[model samples]
Target chain A: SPILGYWKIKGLVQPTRLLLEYLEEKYEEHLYERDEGDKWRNKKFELGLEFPNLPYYIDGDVKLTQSMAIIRYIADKHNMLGGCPKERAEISMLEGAVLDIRYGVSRIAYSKDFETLKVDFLSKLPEMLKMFEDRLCHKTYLNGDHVTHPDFMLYDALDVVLYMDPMCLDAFPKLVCFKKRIEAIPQIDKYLKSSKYIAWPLQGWQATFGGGDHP
Target chain B: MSPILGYWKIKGLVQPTRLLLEYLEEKYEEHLYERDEGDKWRNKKFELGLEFPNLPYYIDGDVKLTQSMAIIRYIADKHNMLGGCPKERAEISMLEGAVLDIRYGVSRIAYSKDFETLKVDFLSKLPEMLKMFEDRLCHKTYLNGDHVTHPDFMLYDALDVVLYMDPMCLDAFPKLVCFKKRIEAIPQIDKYLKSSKYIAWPLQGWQATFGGGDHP
Candidate 1:
């Protein structure tokens, strides 16, 4: 039995929850938001089975922290790690590298540094996007044919931009197509349509362009 | 075909070479060296390999670079990567941490305020040694246990002062015992030792210690 204890319906943490739901994994999505908030947060984080931060997994006696770590664990256990070792390493690298990009975008989204953000994104992101485009040119997935962690990572990353800067995709045509390809995953599509996954405010910036706050 | 690459005999890069040789089923002895000419050492490293600067580097197929990344790629091509998925991530983190500790260890070893070797004895080595110098360190051999990342091969196998310490004198450290036992159990290691690929020697303070040579 897997215990995913965290504040549900919140941003950033929702994707992993949604991922579990998409896979239809039998696990508890424990919401620790109610009752004494700060006290519970601290106690649960420090002494509890989790470490680093929230949205952790408890598998038997083993407590794993780090969202990406948990995600990769589940993905690998499901035989979804990818094809070969080299491919696996490449996928991991892509996922980490893309996360860096998303975090960069998040910094700009939160900060008032429009000029810096625009300059940085407009200059650096395209080159990064172009690298992705080159990798995606002959291959359907980031690694090869099968969708791997980076696919989920890619989807989650674009989802960040979709809410934050939908127009950003205009710069990378191939990535736009790739983003649509990821959304077309049956599991992801099903999660998107389900009301459970619709907990985030779907109005204004978020509703208009799927933008919730960056996480 | 096996590729010839230059690497520092010290553990950091040397351990991976040990693994690669084991993976390839090749028998070889590691050639250990200590700087005979300290005054003209700047010229030694350059003439030693294509890139001529630091140790723990590799040379293969017209490419020459320093750092674990280059060595790891070459080794992983021969052996399987650390693990798949989550294990792989943890393997990477472990490998990174292992190298990170080595970097920290190197810093303490090479402590020089202004290029002058102070009166600091080798006593600073104890704290760093204690950090990784325990028995549990070897219980699982590979840094990530079952999965042997490229770094783990070199790190666990490379004979340095850290190991070969007077076990009787320092019998209190459990982790050190674990580290040695774990490294010895690696299947590839025994055969590599029998063959000539491994370069096992007592750690040379001149090469392994810091500030022992002039930087070019």
Candidate 2:
């Protein structure tokens, strides 16, 4: 079993948690509450993660941080990265794009300039989604027929944005369908229904938005 | 028969990837766009056939792509420098994320409106960043322990960009200086560094207020 640690919020850790459930791997989650006072930072020093940060993973000898790093490690261990050079390239390319979306939204959500920043974000949102939509074309998943880790990451990215602005993805039918398709995966469906899925407060304690229960 | 590495004529995001191409001795031609000549890349952007048509794109035959790290990983993967084993691969990815977080901080400040104020904060935090990276470097020749990974290129670019800001930054971290030297000693990189091919000035985008010109 592995130990996964993050702020009690859903946030950047959700993708890793989602992957864990989809893989059916049993792991312990260490949630550091914002109000819990000094526990996470105290443990941060105790843990051997060389570059310590939120959403860390520790399994036997392998200790890791960085949400994507943890997710990719799990994906690689389970042989879900990609089968060929072309597949790997596409997956990584999609990964980078989704990561941009993820961090972009986060920068606004946690920003004091949320009102102003979000306008710039939304202004460019359509173009960004169109690129993703264009990439999807007619595929069931991001990598076309295979549900690689980027598929999981993309879902989290879209879902977070959709929460931010419900009308955001309404313009991109392929992206909307892609989200539905991801949710319909049997493992994902069960986890989504499970108590363990833990949706809501889509961001962390300091966020100006998404700090409430899922509607 | 070479691929095209396209971007503006600057170090900015393209530096590390450029370094890797040099290190691999890959015979790739550059498509350098100029800020003064905006229409060149603006008109050219639509024709690339990329999924996310952006600058800093790489086109090798049918494999056309964007995103800096994705391009780096693609080239590194072809060369088997990603990692030899699962654990090593995990470590490499971890460092990539770690190094990137710091890299973004440097770039953010470099292009910021209030460079002097941000410079104070960044400089204050710079040592801790270098110290953590120093410990990660520890005794390893490269970040991947004698094996060159994509993050090594990223780390070098970040350190060099930082050095431009603070020349005295690496003084306390001798291993980092040696690591920098070690990377430069590689023949292909040495050639590229000295040759006209390297873009040292305009270390960031034209929009950047600081380090956007030869004077830093």
Candidate 3:
């Protein structure tokens, strides 16, 4: 048996799932429904001492938490991190930057003041998108030649933003093409169309970004 | 010529790098820039390319990197401080993420106007978080077990901020107290502490006591 990944029926684990599907690795997804409060609480504390919180991952002998850490672990095992030390560093840098952008989106997604967040998201997201667009200008992906972890990271977040506002990536042609390229991957494409995919409301938070209803 | 590390003349994101460099005995120039009166990092950050346009960036010949974790990992990889295997590295990353979670709490306190609310939130959560680390240390020498990695430096630095806020912070966690003592006893860090290279605690120009009081 491979690793057993646990998370809510949400999109937080989407990138990790995408990587696993792309590699065609066999792993079990131990999902907790939104109303399964007792199960989530009990398992959380049982594993909380070693690795706390939700989206916990358990391998043969390794139990890892943190989405990025879990993704990096799988990426390292699959040779998808990078080719060399410098390349790996570059990939890590981009990953961090993408996380920063995601942090901004989360701020909006979790904000109580929906109007304020809408304005903030609309105003700031394009600037961040332009940065990613410019980076993908000369390279095939965020990194130079091949696809790396940052590619999936950026794709997952951008997919949410595009869902929120379909015109978000229209100004950035490279990013639009980048999203399409990742979407065109056979495994990702199948997963995107599959019933297992959680379409809207990335998390359990309020529907601030037009994500209350499904597509 | 050694590599250059650029940061805003503070211990915000550069402490872990300093600790790593000191541990590795790597000779590097610390290029500190004062936060401008009006715009802090506009000019310096603008010079960096679109790939990475952030502070605390490192430039060593061909390798130019940003994000403190990325820089720390690169340095650790060069010096064999990132642990021995993939599992060890993953463990280190998990611990590093834990430290990052603590850093978020610190940031909330640093930026909050309602000191009482932030203080209550932070104080209430510290015990549970420290207990987690304390439990980990009971089974191993460090977070990764038998070796020091970026997480140790991060936890030490974050612990300093906590201790500055409350000197009696680690009284309940004996293992963490011992861990801090062991890290401080490292020769390079001890020497750096005795020397003028070390920055003052609690940070200057900000509210002195946990970002709430005047500078002494």
Q: Pick the candidate with the highest DockQ.
A: 2
CAPRI tier for the interface of model 2: medium
In candidate 3, position B21 carries an lDDT of 89
Candidate 2: tens digits of C-alpha lDDT, residues A1-215: 89998877788888888888888899998887768648776677678888878889999969898887899899999987777666677778888899888887875675466788788888888887888898889778877777788888889989888876899988899999999988898999999998777777778665787764444
lDDT of 2 at A211: 68
The segments of candidate 2 whose C-alpha lies over 4 angstroms from its true place after superposition are A210-215, B114-121
Model 3 clash pairs? none
Candidate 1 lDDT, B30-54, residue by residue in tens: 3244445343444545665432234
lDDT of model number 2: 0.83
DockQ comparisons of all candidates to the true complex: 0.06, 0.64, 0.63
Q: Once all C-alphas are superposed, what RMSD does model 2 give against the true structure?
A: 2.1
Distance from true position, residue B149, model 1, in Å?
5.1
Model 3 chain A lowest lDDT segment of ten:
A205-214
Q: Rate the local accuracy (lDDT) of all candidates.
A: 0.53, 0.83, 0.75
Over the stretch A151-171, how does candidate 3's per-residue lDDT look in tens digits? 888988897777668888888
Real interface contacts reproduced by model 2, as a fraction: 0.66
* Candidate 3, residue B18: lDDT: 89
Write model 2 residue lDDT over B146-211, tens digit each, in one string: 677789999999888888888999999999999999999999889999998977788888778777
Candidate 1 has a TM-score of: 0.51
Q: Which residue runs of candidate 1 sit more than 4 Å off their true CA positions?
A: A6-15, A31-37, A44-52, A106-115, A198-215, B1-216
Candidate 3 residues B48-165, lDDT tens each? 6536677788988879788888899889877776656678778888898888777656764564344456577788888888888999999899788787777889998888777866
- By lDDT, the best candidate is 2
